[PDB]
From a paper:
Contractile bacteriophages of the family Myoviridae (i.e. T4), R-type pyocins and the type VI secretion system (T6SS) of Gram-negative bacteria are evolutionarily related nano-scale injection machines that puncture target cell membranes using a shared contraction mechanism. Consistent with this, phylogenetic analysis has suggested that the [name] family can be subdivided into three clades (TssA1, TssA2 and TssA3).
Nested deletion of consecutive helical segments of TssA1B CTD revealed that loss of α15 resulted in the failure of the protein to assemble into a high molecular weight ring, and structure determination of the construct H12–H14 (helices α12–α14) and of that consisting of α12 and α13 alone (residues 303–347), revealed them both to be dimers. In the assembled Bc TssA1B CTD ring, analysis by PISA32 revealed an extensive dimer interface (~950 Å2) between monomers in the different layers, which principally involves the interaction of residues located in helices α12–α13 with their two-fold related subunits forming a region of hydrophobic packing with hydrophilic interactions at the periphery.
Residue numbers in the entry:
A (entry chain A): 302 to 358
B (entry chain B): 302 to 354
The structure:
């Protein structure tokens, strides 16, 4: 019974933290971490970095 | 508040269910589901399977 997205993300981040702490090098740690990065407006940041890199239009 | 592994796996599964339902077939749903699948794989299995040639 997870009610909203904000709470789902917090909980995803807590799970990633746990597995990082107890099984740092596992698949489950790696995937949970990548899931967490995909939960957090990641196309915005990426585009910004692509543009910064081109330097111009 | 995460106090044992079984509980981390349950939270992980519930997160997978939430993103599956709300943002089906998004990167987050896929990765969280896949993490939930691989959470039950023991060390003696994944240590070889990750680098199977």
């Amino acid at each position: 019974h997870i009610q909203n997205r904000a709470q789902a993300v917090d909980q995803l981040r807590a799970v990633a933290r746990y597995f990082r702490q107890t099984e740092p090098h596992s698949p489950v740690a790696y995937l949970a971490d990548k899931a967490a990065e995909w939960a957090d407006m990641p196309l915005h940041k990426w585009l910004e970095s692509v543009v910064k890199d081109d330097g111009s239009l």
